[PDB]
Amino acid sequence: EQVAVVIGGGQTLGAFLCEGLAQAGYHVAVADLNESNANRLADTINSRYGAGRAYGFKVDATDEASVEALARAVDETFGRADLLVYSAGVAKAAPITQFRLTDFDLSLQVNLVGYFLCSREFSKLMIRDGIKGRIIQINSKSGKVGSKHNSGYSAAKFGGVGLTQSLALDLAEYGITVHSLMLGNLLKSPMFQSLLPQYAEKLGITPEEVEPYYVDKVPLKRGCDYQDVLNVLLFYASDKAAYCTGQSINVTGGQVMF
Amino acid sequence: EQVAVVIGGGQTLGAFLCEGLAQAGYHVAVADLNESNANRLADTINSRYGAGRAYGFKVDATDEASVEALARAVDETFGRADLLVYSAGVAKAAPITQFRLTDFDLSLQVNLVGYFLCSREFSKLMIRDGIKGRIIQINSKSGKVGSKHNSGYSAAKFGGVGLTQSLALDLAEYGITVHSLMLGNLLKSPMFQSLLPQYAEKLGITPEEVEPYYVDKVPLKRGCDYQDVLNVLLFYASDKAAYCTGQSINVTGGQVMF
Amino acid sequence: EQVAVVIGGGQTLGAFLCEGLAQAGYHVAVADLNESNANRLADTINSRYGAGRAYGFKVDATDEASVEALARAVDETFGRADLLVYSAGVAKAAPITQFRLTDFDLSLQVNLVGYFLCSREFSKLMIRDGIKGRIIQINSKSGKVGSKHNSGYSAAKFGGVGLTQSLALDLAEYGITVHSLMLGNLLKSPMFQSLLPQYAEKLGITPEEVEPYYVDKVPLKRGCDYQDVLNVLLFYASDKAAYCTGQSINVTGGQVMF
Amino acid sequence: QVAVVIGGGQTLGAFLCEGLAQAGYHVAVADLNESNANRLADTINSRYGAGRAYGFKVDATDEASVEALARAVDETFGRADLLVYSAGVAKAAPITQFRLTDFDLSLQVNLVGYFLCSREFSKLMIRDGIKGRIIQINSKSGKVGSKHNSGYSAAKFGGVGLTQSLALDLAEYGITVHSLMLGNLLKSPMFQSLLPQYAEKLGITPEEVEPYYVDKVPLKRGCDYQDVLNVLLFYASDKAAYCTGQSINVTGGQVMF
Ligand SMILES: [Cl-]
Ligand SMILES: [Cl-]
Ligand SMILES: [Cl-]
Ligand SMILES: [Cl-]
């Protein structure tokens, strides 16, 4: 009977996790800024796995009223919340010298303030109902090791780790655990694929040589795929990981061991 | 059809893990300094899971001849080796001023040299058969933070981490992943129970208040259970954690979040 | 002939670092929200060290126009900049379920965006003039370990570590190094001294029990003092620490060793 | 103030002995090669004069030897203020070919010797009420596991663990303890001799080994003996009294955790 709320649910990784959770037997609130994508995914889940397994919702995670309204809506639809997945954030690269304040502010709003607001709202619902819940943030190796030309992304992602640990400490007395998943490069993803040019120029190499460059830094000699993320998420979300909380869990093929 | 070799399988945590592995489907090589405890545990698994599921072996993991003979005995018994679990080590508490060399040396032998020997012999078997195998070390929060009056235990357990990371780097090309599990206090274990009077003094409090003193340091407000151990182990040993290697996985109720 | 700019130089710790830097032989730009505080401390410094040693400047580090003007003002005044010290931001406590967005937001502006603006604008000066400069941020043990009831503060202080590492990588090619200093508790701060009541309440004990309570957490059995900060600051700002960059330097009396 | 340097009779260790004396320390220069320790202390004695440095023999892996060094320094100098532990050399092999004797040796030299020398010299500090300093020379391989160097990594990570436990045990006596996590000392004789192996370890020509490692480092150079000496002096000083139990990176930004 568990309910999963996925912020950033309407596309790519977030959308897969939504389908993955549904396949695992959760009911899913697909929540996105693009309501049309949210509802289109919810219908696809329902076509694939049965009636009423998902519902689509609009939220701007950066806005307090919007977050409050989503939580009200989710409660009205499903009556409980068990698992919050927060998926958001896109790195915009520039040397510190030329990094815009608007971009830095955006990174902070989308990766930190939205994470805060969604966590605060859904933990309240978990507490109300005596639910030993789970909060899982999608994060990055960039939240473990500073990324050259990506100060806004690293600052925001490091910050995510700090928030995950404060939330874990605040929420432990209610049986809610909180983690951040520190993902390696989703090399075949549409986002990674579209930046192969930009990487080529930062690294001084050809677009076609970028994926081998990054593969070669991974001990297991391959990039991360969405199923790697889902599988880790599933375990940490489950009752079997009840004694783990506040962690930065690496999913990096061994590239990060700290 | 996988085989798990559990070094330290004859008693307490290690026995619990052998049984749990068998519950999960594994054939189990119960390996132990006490061959009699090992053979008896194997008998118990066989009556519960069917003939030939488990066999007992003698090993002294500090002795190279003994470990090489264990790996040959496992190979002759089962087709193969898929998971190595290394479970050994008990802390001895003394201020550095009084710490004996013999005990420091023994902490290294048992916690580190044995881990190295077992990893070495069993990895050659995995490599021989092209098995995408698993090596899992039982370690401690004292391998994440040095522990007062436990210099020997901390040196050895931090050591185990370094070994894990090196082994992960050496074997990744063969699809073998390597992890350390950084356990909290196993408050219910017979060892922990026996030491209540010694910790009572060392702290400056009664025996009865020890468990609550250590429980209070934990955000989740309980001790580590054998089941928590087995849960985490089974995940990292599974094909669902194929993109994780070289890690220090905390199982601490949020006491350790770095 | 080096010039130090200290943001938040007009009182308490910032004021102590300004004096300490003048003593070490620096020209000091005292930058603060309170311009009269900035000017008077600079007068004190010139009354001891000679006219034109120190100048006071107004800055709102959270405002881009105010930071960009500060940089123009310092350049007009001293003609160069060698060391940026960013010393800003305070702790506001409340469990996540009552923690306000305004405060979370303010924490990010003061602790993080100010640090990004100041680093941006003074790095450009350092680059222009070919200076192998230093950027040092005042951070907290709360940027190493998440703080119960202090989500806004931990998020922002961890985010500072991330910004420090990305800065370091962006600026390495120019011989500029960047560090974050992870301070323990400044128990004899006015700040800390005035908050004894709240910690008393939060923890459940008389205000007279509060300093003892935090002391006993430190292995060195001492609170952090301003001179420890200065000491470490001076070393990492020196040409002796040229091969160190991107570091989170603990100044914690052994409370934090990771 | 007296400094004891283990492994002081050669290379980085020698460098450190010359630097501490220049910085104003009385040096007890201690090595397995007693001939080296004796003449480095006279190399030192022909610059800073006489009675400065003294050469002692020690097999840091041997309890008797280490305890005899501790009684001898107390006779020679009357006190101990700083212990520098400088030993250990990496032997490379894939785990599958790694010899036990080599693993055992790495632990004895890198970890057991550090334990023994910290134990003995810390007693001498406690006796004379000294708020002293124990500093270990370690490596980035004590921060991140090194491929084909299981022995060296296990040992060097071990040393961090020991550093932290020591710090916690010795804090009530005002003694601080740290490990220095060094980058590659590219010009050292050791590094220079092993370029062919590193070259065949990585599938490069020898001459292209150093630039392959320099390119890894955000500051774009190797670690220098002087970077080591600079950090040691700071953490060895009373200015660093509030720092203990740390792993201090000296890696040009290659390691930031
Ligand atoms: Cl945990
Ligand atoms: Cl990983
Ligand atoms: Cl560094
Ligand atoms: Cl510290």
PDB file of all heavy atoms in Angstrom, chain A residues 165 172 220 222-224 231 236 240 242-243 247 250 253 256-257, chain B residues 165 219-220 222-223 231 236 240 242-244 247 250 253 256-257:
ATOM      1  N   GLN A 165      21.854  15.354   6.091  1.00  0.00           N
ATOM      2  CA  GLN A 165      22.283  14.999   7.418  1.00  0.00           C
ATOM      3  C   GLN A 165      21.463  15.754   8.516  1.00  0.00           C
ATOM      4  O   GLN A 165      21.156  15.144   9.532  1.00  0.00           O
ATOM      5  CB  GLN A 165      23.743  15.282   7.631  1.00  0.00           C
ATOM      6  CG  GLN A 165      24.717  14.514   6.747  1.00  0.00           C
ATOM      7  CD  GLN A 165      26.152  14.701   7.126  1.00  0.00           C
ATOM      8  OE1 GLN A 165      26.518  15.132   8.274  1.00  0.00           O
ATOM      9  NE2 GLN A 165      27.030  14.257   6.199  1.00  0.00           N
ATOM     10  N   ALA A 172      14.917  11.564  12.918  1.00  0.00           N
ATOM     11  CA  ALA A 172      15.197  10.141  13.370  1.00  0.00           C
ATOM     12  C   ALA A 172      14.246   9.645  14.480  1.00  0.00           C
ATOM     13  O   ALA A 172      13.909   8.427  14.616  1.00  0.00           O
ATOM     14  CB  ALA A 172      16.622  10.066  13.825  1.00  0.00           C
ATOM     15  N   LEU A 220      34.958   0.313 -12.719  1.00  0.00           N
ATOM     16  CA  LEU A 220      34.142  -0.681 -13.375  1.00  0.00           C
ATOM     17  C   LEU A 220      33.941  -0.424 -14.865  1.00  0.00           C
ATOM     18  O   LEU A 220      33.212  -1.168 -15.514  1.00  0.00           O
ATOM     19  CB  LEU A 220      32.811  -0.846 -12.630  1.00  0.00           C
ATOM     20  CG  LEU A 220      32.964  -1.345 -11.217  1.00  0.00           C
ATOM     21  CD1 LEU A 220      31.690  -1.180 -10.337  1.00  0.00           C
ATOM     22  CD2 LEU A 220      33.406  -2.819 -11.336  1.00  0.00           C
ATOM     23  N   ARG A 222      32.404   1.611 -17.070  1.00  0.00           N
ATOM     24  CA  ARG A 222      31.122   1.868 -17.721  1.00  0.00           C
ATOM     25  C   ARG A 222      30.453   3.055 -17.008  1.00  0.00           C
ATOM     26  O   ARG A 222      30.839   3.423 -15.888  1.00  0.00           O
ATOM     27  CB  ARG A 222      30.222   0.611 -17.715  1.00  0.00           C
ATOM     28  CG  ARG A 222      29.773   0.050 -16.322  1.00  0.00           C
ATOM     29  CD  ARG A 222      28.539  -0.825 -16.534  1.00  0.00           C
ATOM     30  NE  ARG A 222      27.803  -1.343 -15.381  1.00  0.00           N
ATOM     31  CZ  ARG A 222      26.755  -0.736 -14.730  1.00  0.00           C
ATOM     32  NH1 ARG A 222      26.343   0.500 -15.027  1.00  0.00           N
ATOM     33  NH2 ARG A 222      26.129  -1.379 -13.709  1.00  0.00           N
ATOM     34  N   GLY A 223      29.467   3.675 -17.669  1.00  0.00           N
ATOM     35  CA  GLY A 223      28.777   4.785 -17.018  1.00  0.00           C
ATOM     36  C   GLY A 223      27.651   4.213 -16.147  1.00  0.00           C
ATOM     37  O   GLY A 223      27.426   3.023 -16.122  1.00  0.00           O
ATOM     38  N   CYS A 224      26.917   5.116 -15.506  1.00  0.00           N
ATOM     39  CA  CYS A 224      25.819   4.776 -14.582  1.00  0.00           C
ATOM     40  C   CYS A 224      24.619   4.719 -15.450  1.00  0.00           C
ATOM     41  O   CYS A 224      24.520   5.576 -16.320  1.00  0.00           O
ATOM     42  CB  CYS A 224      25.634   5.887 -13.582  1.00  0.00           C
ATOM     43  SG  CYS A 224      24.481   5.621 -12.226  1.00  0.00           S
ATOM     44  N   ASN A 231      17.809   0.724  -8.325  1.00  0.00           N
ATOM     45  CA  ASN A 231      18.108  -0.405  -7.472  1.00  0.00           C
ATOM     46  C   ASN A 231      18.603   0.022  -6.166  1.00  0.00           C
ATOM     47  O   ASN A 231      18.122  -0.540  -5.131  1.00  0.00           O
ATOM     48  CB  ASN A 231      19.108  -1.338  -8.126  1.00  0.00           C
ATOM     49  CG  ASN A 231      18.473  -2.215  -9.166  1.00  0.00           C
ATOM     50  OD1 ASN A 231      17.247  -2.357  -9.205  1.00  0.00           O
ATOM     51  ND2 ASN A 231      19.315  -2.903  -9.971  1.00  0.00           N
ATOM     52  N   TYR A 236      17.387   1.386  -0.197  1.00  0.00           N
ATOM     53  CA  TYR A 236      17.361   2.434   0.890  1.00  0.00           C
ATOM     54  C   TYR A 236      15.929   2.849   1.305  1.00  0.00           C
ATOM     55  O   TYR A 236      15.666   3.133   2.476  1.00  0.00           O
ATOM     56  CB  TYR A 236      18.331   3.621   0.640  1.00  0.00           C
ATOM     57  CG  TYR A 236      19.793   3.194   0.937  1.00  0.00           C
ATOM     58  CD1 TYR A 236      20.626   2.670  -0.083  1.00  0.00           C
ATOM     59  CD2 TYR A 236      20.281   3.150   2.219  1.00  0.00           C
ATOM     60  CE1 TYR A 236      21.895   2.186   0.185  1.00  0.00           C
ATOM     61  CE2 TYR A 236      21.614   2.712   2.482  1.00  0.00           C
ATOM     62  CZ  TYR A 236      22.391   2.211   1.458  1.00  0.00           C
ATOM     63  OH  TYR A 236      23.674   1.760   1.723  1.00  0.00           O
ATOM     64  N   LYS A 240      14.157  -2.835   4.970  1.00  0.00           N
ATOM     65  CA  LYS A 240      15.438  -3.505   5.272  1.00  0.00           C
ATOM     66  C   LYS A 240      16.569  -2.535   5.569  1.00  0.00           C
ATOM     67  O   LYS A 240      17.530  -2.949   6.144  1.00  0.00           O
ATOM     68  CB  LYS A 240      15.895  -4.419   4.116  1.00  0.00           C
ATOM     69  CG  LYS A 240      14.949  -5.521   3.777  1.00  0.00           C
ATOM     70  CD  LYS A 240      15.349  -6.117   2.445  1.00  0.00           C
ATOM     71  CE  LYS A 240      14.663  -7.441   2.229  1.00  0.00           C
ATOM     72  NZ  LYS A 240      14.872  -7.950   0.839  1.00  0.00           N
ATOM     73  N   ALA A 242      16.322   0.182   7.518  1.00  0.00           N
ATOM     74  CA  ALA A 242      15.821   0.997   8.608  1.00  0.00           C
ATOM     75  C   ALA A 242      16.906   1.556   9.483  1.00  0.00           C
ATOM     76  O   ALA A 242      16.688   2.661  10.019  1.00  0.00           O
ATOM     77  CB  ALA A 242      14.777   0.285   9.480  1.00  0.00           C
ATOM     78  N   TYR A 243      18.049   0.875   9.629  1.00  0.00           N
ATOM     79  CA  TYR A 243      19.106   1.341  10.506  1.00  0.00           C
ATOM     80  C   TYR A 243      20.146   2.224   9.839  1.00  0.00           C
ATOM     81  O   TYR A 243      21.167   2.479  10.432  1.00  0.00           O
ATOM     82  CB  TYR A 243      19.814   0.186  11.203  1.00  0.00           C
ATOM     83  CG  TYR A 243      20.532   0.555  12.476  1.00  0.00           C
ATOM     84  CD1 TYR A 243      19.847   1.131  13.541  1.00  0.00           C
ATOM     85  CD2 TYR A 243      21.891   0.263  12.677  1.00  0.00           C
ATOM     86  CE1 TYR A 243      20.495   1.423  14.722  1.00  0.00           C
ATOM     87  CE2 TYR A 243      22.519   0.570  13.867  1.00  0.00           C
ATOM     88  CZ  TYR A 243      21.823   1.187  14.852  1.00  0.00           C
ATOM     89  OH  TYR A 243      22.448   1.520  16.018  1.00  0.00           O
ATOM     90  N   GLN A 247      22.981   9.305   5.028  1.00  0.00           N
ATOM     91  CA  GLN A 247      24.130   8.918   4.285  1.00  0.00           C
ATOM     92  C   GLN A 247      24.228   9.591   2.901  1.00  0.00           C
ATOM     93  O   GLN A 247      23.239   9.939   2.291  1.00  0.00           O
ATOM     94  CB  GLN A 247      24.103   7.395   4.107  1.00  0.00           C
ATOM     95  CG  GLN A 247      24.098   6.609   5.394  1.00  0.00           C
ATOM     96  CD  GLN A 247      25.270   6.925   6.271  1.00  0.00           C
ATOM     97  OE1 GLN A 247      26.395   6.936   5.811  1.00  0.00           O
ATOM     98  NE2 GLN A 247      25.009   7.216   7.532  1.00  0.00           N
ATOM     99  N   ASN A 250      27.293   6.404  -2.465  1.00  0.00           N
ATOM    100  CA  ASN A 250      27.898   6.525  -3.828  1.00  0.00           C
ATOM    101  C   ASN A 250      27.383   5.472  -4.822  1.00  0.00           C
ATOM    102  O   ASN A 250      27.257   4.256  -4.481  1.00  0.00           O
ATOM    103  CB  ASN A 250      29.421   6.474  -3.772  1.00  0.00           C
ATOM    104  CG  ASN A 250      29.992   7.515  -2.902  1.00  0.00           C
ATOM    105  OD1 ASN A 250      29.615   8.717  -2.971  1.00  0.00           O
ATOM    106  ND2 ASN A 250      30.978   7.106  -2.087  1.00  0.00           N
ATOM    107  N   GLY A 253      30.565   3.457  -9.706  1.00  0.00           N
ATOM    108  CA  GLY A 253      31.305   2.450 -10.284  1.00  0.00           C
ATOM    109  C   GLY A 253      32.715   2.449  -9.668  1.00  0.00           C
ATOM    110  O   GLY A 253      33.672   2.009 -10.300  1.00  0.00           O
ATOM    111  N   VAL A 256      34.336   7.183  -6.766  1.00  0.00           N
ATOM    112  CA  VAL A 256      34.449   7.799  -5.447  1.00  0.00           C
ATOM    113  C   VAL A 256      34.262   6.746  -4.369  1.00  0.00           C
ATOM    114  O   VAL A 256      33.218   6.139  -4.354  1.00  0.00           O
ATOM    115  CB  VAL A 256      33.266   8.804  -5.286  1.00  0.00           C
ATOM    116  CG1 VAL A 256      33.324   9.563  -4.008  1.00  0.00           C
ATOM    117  CG2 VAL A 256      33.294   9.814  -6.450  1.00  0.00           C
ATOM    118  N   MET A 257      35.253   6.620  -3.478  1.00  0.00           N
ATOM    119  CA  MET A 257      35.283   5.626  -2.397  1.00  0.00           C
ATOM    120  C   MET A 257      35.231   6.265  -1.020  1.00  0.00           C
ATOM    121  O   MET A 257      35.162   5.566  -0.032  1.00  0.00           O
ATOM    122  CB  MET A 257      36.527   4.731  -2.619  1.00  0.00           C
ATOM    123  CG  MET A 257      36.400   3.934  -3.866  1.00  0.00           C
ATOM    124  SD  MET A 257      37.690   2.683  -4.025  1.00  0.00           S
ATOM    125  CE  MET A 257      37.354   1.907  -5.617  1.00  0.00           C
TER     126      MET A 257
ATOM    127  N   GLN B 165      39.599  -0.635  -0.544  1.00  0.00           N
ATOM    128  CA  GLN B 165      39.666   0.291  -1.681  1.00  0.00           C
ATOM    129  C   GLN B 165      40.714  -0.230  -2.681  1.00  0.00           C
ATOM    130  O   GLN B 165      40.475  -0.282  -3.880  1.00  0.00           O
ATOM    131  CB  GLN B 165      39.984   1.714  -1.180  1.00  0.00           C
ATOM    132  CG  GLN B 165      38.840   2.355  -0.396  1.00  0.00           C
ATOM    133  CD  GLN B 165      39.046   3.844  -0.139  1.00  0.00           C
ATOM    134  OE1 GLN B 165      39.866   4.467  -0.837  1.00  0.00           O
ATOM    135  NE2 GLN B 165      38.299   4.442   0.845  1.00  0.00           N
ATOM    136  N   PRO B 219      21.186   8.560  16.803  1.00  0.00           N
ATOM    137  CA  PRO B 219      19.955   9.249  16.420  1.00  0.00           C
ATOM    138  C   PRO B 219      18.719   8.381  16.299  1.00  0.00           C
ATOM    139  O   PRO B 219      17.635   8.803  16.748  1.00  0.00           O
ATOM    140  CB  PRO B 219      20.328   9.905  15.089  1.00  0.00           C
ATOM    141  CG  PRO B 219      21.800  10.099  15.175  1.00  0.00           C
ATOM    142  CD  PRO B 219      22.272   8.883  15.896  1.00  0.00           C
ATOM    143  N   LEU B 220      18.813   7.160  15.760  1.00  0.00           N
ATOM    144  CA  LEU B 220      17.682   6.311  15.697  1.00  0.00           C
ATOM    145  C   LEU B 220      17.320   5.617  17.043  1.00  0.00           C
ATOM    146  O   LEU B 220      16.333   4.890  17.132  1.00  0.00           O
ATOM    147  CB  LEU B 220      17.801   5.229  14.582  1.00  0.00           C
ATOM    148  CG  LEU B 220      17.685   5.728  13.188  1.00  0.00           C
ATOM    149  CD1 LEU B 220      17.990   4.671  12.069  1.00  0.00           C
ATOM    150  CD2 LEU B 220      16.278   6.334  12.983  1.00  0.00           C
ATOM    151  N   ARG B 222      18.500   3.090  18.880  1.00  0.00           N
ATOM    152  CA  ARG B 222      18.744   1.683  19.237  1.00  0.00           C
ATOM    153  C   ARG B 222      20.121   1.231  18.775  1.00  0.00           C
ATOM    154  O   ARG B 222      20.783   1.924  18.005  1.00  0.00           O
ATOM    155  CB  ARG B 222      17.639   0.758  18.674  1.00  0.00           C
ATOM    156  CG  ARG B 222      17.590   0.773  17.123  1.00  0.00           C
ATOM    157  CD  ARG B 222      16.446  -0.014  16.574  1.00  0.00           C
ATOM    158  NE  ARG B 222      16.469   0.009  15.127  1.00  0.00           N
ATOM    159  CZ  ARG B 222      15.923   0.930  14.345  1.00  0.00           C
ATOM    160  NH1 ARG B 222      15.204   1.983  14.851  1.00  0.00           N
ATOM    161  NH2 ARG B 222      16.084   0.790  13.013  1.00  0.00           N
ATOM    162  N   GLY B 223      20.508   0.017  19.183  1.00  0.00           N
ATOM    163  CA  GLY B 223      21.789  -0.614  18.806  1.00  0.00           C
ATOM    164  C   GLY B 223      21.606  -1.293  17.457  1.00  0.00           C
ATOM    165  O   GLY B 223      20.485  -1.313  16.959  1.00  0.00           O
ATOM    166  N   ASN B 231      20.848  -7.528   6.230  1.00  0.00           N
ATOM    167  CA  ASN B 231      20.127  -6.756   5.170  1.00  0.00           C
ATOM    168  C   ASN B 231      21.017  -6.004   4.246  1.00  0.00           C
ATOM    169  O   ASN B 231      20.894  -6.138   3.033  1.00  0.00           O
ATOM    170  CB  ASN B 231      19.139  -5.825   5.808  1.00  0.00           C
ATOM    171  CG  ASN B 231      17.930  -6.549   6.330  1.00  0.00           C
ATOM    172  OD1 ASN B 231      17.679  -7.723   5.995  1.00  0.00           O
ATOM    173  ND2 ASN B 231      17.188  -5.866   7.148  1.00  0.00           N
ATOM    174  N   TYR B 236      24.444  -5.434  -1.069  1.00  0.00           N
ATOM    175  CA  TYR B 236      25.772  -5.214  -1.691  1.00  0.00           C
ATOM    176  C   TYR B 236      26.369  -6.447  -2.356  1.00  0.00           C
ATOM    177  O   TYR B 236      27.021  -6.340  -3.390  1.00  0.00           O
ATOM    178  CB  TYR B 236      26.741  -4.473  -0.707  1.00  0.00           C
ATOM    179  CG  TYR B 236      26.305  -3.001  -0.581  1.00  0.00           C
ATOM    180  CD1 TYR B 236      25.525  -2.565   0.457  1.00  0.00           C
ATOM    181  CD2 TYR B 236      26.661  -2.073  -1.548  1.00  0.00           C
ATOM    182  CE1 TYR B 236      25.137  -1.218   0.582  1.00  0.00           C
ATOM    183  CE2 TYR B 236      26.315  -0.752  -1.444  1.00  0.00           C
ATOM    184  CZ  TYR B 236      25.501  -0.324  -0.433  1.00  0.00           C
ATOM    185  OH  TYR B 236      25.172   1.009  -0.414  1.00  0.00           O
ATOM    186  N   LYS B 240      22.038  -6.364  -7.806  1.00  0.00           N
ATOM    187  CA  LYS B 240      21.440  -5.031  -7.774  1.00  0.00           C
ATOM    188  C   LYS B 240      22.404  -3.926  -7.344  1.00  0.00           C
ATOM    189  O   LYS B 240      22.124  -2.742  -7.565  1.00  0.00           O
ATOM    190  CB  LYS B 240      20.197  -5.014  -6.929  1.00  0.00           C
ATOM    191  CG  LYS B 240      19.119  -5.915  -7.469  1.00  0.00           C
ATOM    192  CD  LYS B 240      18.053  -5.978  -6.414  1.00  0.00           C
ATOM    193  CE  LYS B 240      16.850  -6.668  -6.975  1.00  0.00           C
ATOM    194  NZ  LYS B 240      15.927  -6.871  -5.811  1.00  0.00           N
ATOM    195  N   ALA B 242      25.635  -3.756  -8.537  1.00  0.00           N
ATOM    196  CA  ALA B 242      26.788  -3.972  -9.393  1.00  0.00           C
ATOM    197  C   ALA B 242      27.608  -2.735  -9.693  1.00  0.00           C
ATOM    198  O   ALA B 242      28.788  -2.856 -10.040  1.00  0.00           O
ATOM    199  CB  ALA B 242      26.350  -4.608 -10.700  1.00  0.00           C
ATOM    200  N   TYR B 243      27.034  -1.548  -9.550  1.00  0.00           N
ATOM    201  CA  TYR B 243      27.792  -0.333  -9.826  1.00  0.00           C
ATOM    202  C   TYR B 243      28.347   0.380  -8.575  1.00  0.00           C
ATOM    203  O   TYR B 243      28.613   1.622  -8.603  1.00  0.00           O
ATOM    204  CB  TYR B 243      26.885   0.610 -10.644  1.00  0.00           C
ATOM    205  CG  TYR B 243      27.630   1.636 -11.466  1.00  0.00           C
ATOM    206  CD1 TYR B 243      28.538   1.259 -12.434  1.00  0.00           C
ATOM    207  CD2 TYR B 243      27.445   3.015 -11.247  1.00  0.00           C
ATOM    208  CE1 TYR B 243      29.214   2.224 -13.215  1.00  0.00           C
ATOM    209  CE2 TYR B 243      28.136   3.966 -12.001  1.00  0.00           C
ATOM    210  CZ  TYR B 243      29.013   3.574 -12.976  1.00  0.00           C
ATOM    211  OH  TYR B 243      29.714   4.488 -13.680  1.00  0.00           O
ATOM    212  N   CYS B 244      28.389  -0.340  -7.473  1.00  0.00           N
ATOM    213  CA  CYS B 244      28.989   0.101  -6.232  1.00  0.00           C
ATOM    214  C   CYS B 244      30.205  -0.778  -5.912  1.00  0.00           C
ATOM    215  O   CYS B 244      30.036  -1.967  -5.819  1.00  0.00           O
ATOM    216  CB  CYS B 244      27.945   0.042  -5.106  1.00  0.00           C
ATOM    217  SG  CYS B 244      26.442   1.054  -5.350  1.00  0.00           S
ATOM    218  N   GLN B 247      33.420   0.632  -1.270  1.00  0.00           N
ATOM    219  CA  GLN B 247      32.775   1.525  -0.304  1.00  0.00           C
ATOM    220  C   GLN B 247      32.939   1.154   1.172  1.00  0.00           C
ATOM    221  O   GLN B 247      33.170  -0.017   1.513  1.00  0.00           O
ATOM    222  CB  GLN B 247      31.280   1.552  -0.585  1.00  0.00           C
ATOM    223  CG  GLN B 247      30.894   2.063  -1.946  1.00  0.00           C
ATOM    224  CD  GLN B 247      31.457   3.459  -2.264  1.00  0.00           C
ATOM    225  OE1 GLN B 247      31.220   4.382  -1.536  1.00  0.00           O
ATOM    226  NE2 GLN B 247      32.231   3.588  -3.376  1.00  0.00           N
ATOM    227  N   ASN B 250      28.039   2.553   6.026  1.00  0.00           N
ATOM    228  CA  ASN B 250      27.688   2.702   7.463  1.00  0.00           C
ATOM    229  C   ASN B 250      26.400   1.984   7.774  1.00  0.00           C
ATOM    230  O   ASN B 250      25.371   2.104   7.029  1.00  0.00           O
ATOM    231  CB  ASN B 250      27.560   4.224   7.834  1.00  0.00           C
ATOM    232  CG  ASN B 250      28.883   4.993   7.651  1.00  0.00           C
ATOM    233  OD1 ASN B 250      29.952   4.518   7.980  1.00  0.00           O
ATOM    234  ND2 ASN B 250      28.801   6.218   7.094  1.00  0.00           N
ATOM    235  N   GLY B 253      22.804   3.676  12.553  1.00  0.00           N
ATOM    236  CA  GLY B 253      21.628   4.378  13.087  1.00  0.00           C
ATOM    237  C   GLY B 253      21.786   5.884  12.980  1.00  0.00           C
ATOM    238  O   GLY B 253      21.134   6.659  13.730  1.00  0.00           O
ATOM    239  N   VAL B 256      27.218   7.813  12.366  1.00  0.00           N
ATOM    240  CA  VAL B 256      28.293   8.189  11.521  1.00  0.00           C
ATOM    241  C   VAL B 256      27.632   8.532  10.165  1.00  0.00           C
ATOM    242  O   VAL B 256      27.040   7.657   9.540  1.00  0.00           O
ATOM    243  CB  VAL B 256      29.279   7.021  11.325  1.00  0.00           C
ATOM    244  CG1 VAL B 256      30.329   7.341  10.255  1.00  0.00           C
ATOM    245  CG2 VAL B 256      29.974   6.695  12.590  1.00  0.00           C
ATOM    246  N   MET B 257      27.751   9.757   9.740  1.00  0.00           N
ATOM    247  CA  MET B 257      27.205  10.160   8.414  1.00  0.00           C
ATOM    248  C   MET B 257      28.227  10.579   7.334  1.00  0.00           C
ATOM    249  O   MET B 257      27.864  10.916   6.211  1.00  0.00           O
ATOM    250  CB  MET B 257      26.199  11.279   8.685  1.00  0.00           C
ATOM    251  CG  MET B 257      25.016  10.873   9.546  1.00  0.00           C
ATOM    252  SD  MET B 257      23.797  12.255   9.785  1.00  0.00           S
ATOM    253  CE  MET B 257      22.554  11.428  10.701  1.00  0.00           C
TER     254      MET B 257
END
